[PDB]
Amino acid sequence: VEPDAGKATWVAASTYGTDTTTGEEVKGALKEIHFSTYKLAAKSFITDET
Amino acid sequence: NFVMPRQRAVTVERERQAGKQRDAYYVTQRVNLQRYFANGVVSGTYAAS
Asked: How far does the CA of residue B48 sit from the closest CA of chain A (Å)?
Protein backbone atom coordinates (compact mmCIF):
# COMPACT_ATOMS: atom_id res chain seq x y z
CA VAL A 1 0.00 0.00 0.00
CA GLU A 2 1.44 3.39 -1.15
CA PRO A 3 0.89 6.74 0.75
CA ASP A 4 -0.49 10.12 -0.45
CA ALA A 5 1.61 12.82 -2.03
CA GLY A 6 2.50 15.65 -1.43
CA LYS A 7 3.52 19.30 -1.08
CA ALA A 8 5.50 21.21 -3.71
CA THR A 9 6.97 24.64 -2.84
CA TRP A 10 6.35 27.33 -5.47
CA VAL A 11 9.27 29.43 -6.79
CA ALA A 12 10.36 32.93 -5.67
CA ALA A 13 9.34 34.35 -9.12
CA SER A 14 12.90 35.56 -9.94
CA THR A 15 14.93 32.30 -9.79
CA TYR A 16 14.32 30.98 -13.33
CA GLY A 17 17.03 28.27 -13.63
CA THR A 18 20.37 27.94 -11.79
CA ASP A 19 18.52 27.17 -9.57
CA THR A 20 14.79 26.66 -9.43
CA THR A 21 14.32 26.31 -5.65
CA THR A 22 11.37 23.87 -5.92
CA GLY A 23 10.61 21.04 -3.47
CA GLU A 24 12.47 17.79 -3.06
CA GLU A 25 9.77 15.07 -3.05
CA VAL A 26 10.97 11.94 -1.28
CA LYS A 27 10.08 8.69 -3.10
CA GLY A 28 7.03 7.35 -1.19
CA ALA A 29 7.71 4.00 0.46
CA LEU A 30 5.38 1.12 -0.43
CA LYS A 31 4.18 -0.14 2.96
CA GLU A 32 3.58 -3.86 3.45
CA ILE A 33 0.35 -5.18 5.02
CA HIS A 34 0.54 -8.83 6.20
CA PHE A 35 -2.37 -11.15 7.17
CA SER A 36 -2.28 -13.98 9.80
CA THR A 37 -4.75 -16.95 9.72
CA TYR A 38 -5.49 -18.47 13.18
CA LYS A 39 -7.03 -21.94 13.72
CA LEU A 40 -9.58 -23.48 16.07
CA ALA A 41 -11.09 -26.94 16.43
CA ALA A 42 -13.71 -28.77 18.47
CA LYS A 43 -14.25 -32.49 19.06
CA SER A 44 -17.19 -34.63 20.13
CA PHE A 45 -17.91 -38.31 20.69
CA ILE A 46 -20.64 -40.72 21.84
CA THR A 47 -20.16 -44.51 22.41
CA ASP A 48 -22.19 -47.00 20.32
CA GLU A 49 -23.56 -48.59 23.62
CA THR A 50 -25.10 -45.21 24.79
CA ASN B 1 55.37 38.12 -40.93
CA PHE B 2 52.49 39.14 -38.58
CA VAL B 3 50.46 36.02 -39.66
CA MET B 4 47.80 34.50 -37.34
CA PRO B 5 47.77 30.64 -37.09
CA ARG B 6 44.56 28.69 -36.41
CA GLN B 7 43.50 25.01 -36.29
CA ARG B 8 39.81 25.35 -35.53
CA ALA B 9 37.55 28.07 -36.96
CA VAL B 10 34.50 29.43 -35.11
CA THR B 11 31.99 26.62 -34.33
CA VAL B 12 28.66 26.80 -32.47
CA GLU B 13 27.14 24.11 -30.25
CA ARG B 14 24.25 23.80 -27.72
CA GLU B 15 22.83 21.59 -24.91
CA ARG B 16 19.37 21.02 -23.21
CA GLN B 17 20.28 17.89 -21.19
CA ALA B 18 21.20 17.98 -18.25
CA GLY B 19 19.86 21.58 -18.21
CA LYS B 20 16.82 22.88 -16.29
CA GLN B 21 14.38 25.20 -18.10
CA ARG B 22 17.17 26.66 -20.20
CA ASP B 23 18.85 26.28 -23.62
CA ALA B 24 22.45 27.48 -23.90
CA TYR B 25 24.93 28.18 -26.70
CA TYR B 26 28.70 27.70 -26.69
CA VAL B 27 31.19 29.08 -29.26
CA THR B 28 34.87 27.95 -29.14
CA GLN B 29 37.84 28.33 -31.61
CA ARG B 30 41.70 28.06 -31.49
CA VAL B 31 43.98 30.93 -32.72
CA ASN B 32 46.93 33.32 -31.83
CA LEU B 33 48.93 36.30 -33.34
CA GLN B 34 52.76 36.03 -33.81
CA ARG B 35 55.71 38.44 -34.22
CA TYR B 36 57.85 36.30 -36.60
CA PHE B 37 61.25 38.09 -36.83
CA ALA B 38 61.86 40.95 -34.38
CA ASN B 39 60.30 44.15 -35.74
CA GLY B 40 58.20 45.89 -38.44
CA VAL B 41 55.59 47.48 -36.19
CA VAL B 42 56.01 51.05 -34.82
CA SER B 43 53.69 53.31 -32.81
CA GLY B 44 53.96 56.53 -30.70
CA THR B 45 54.74 58.39 -28.43
CA TYR B 46 52.15 60.21 -28.16
CA ALA B 47 52.75 60.18 -24.40
CA ALA B 48 50.98 62.09 -21.60
CA SER B 49 51.42 65.57 -20.11
From this structure: 47
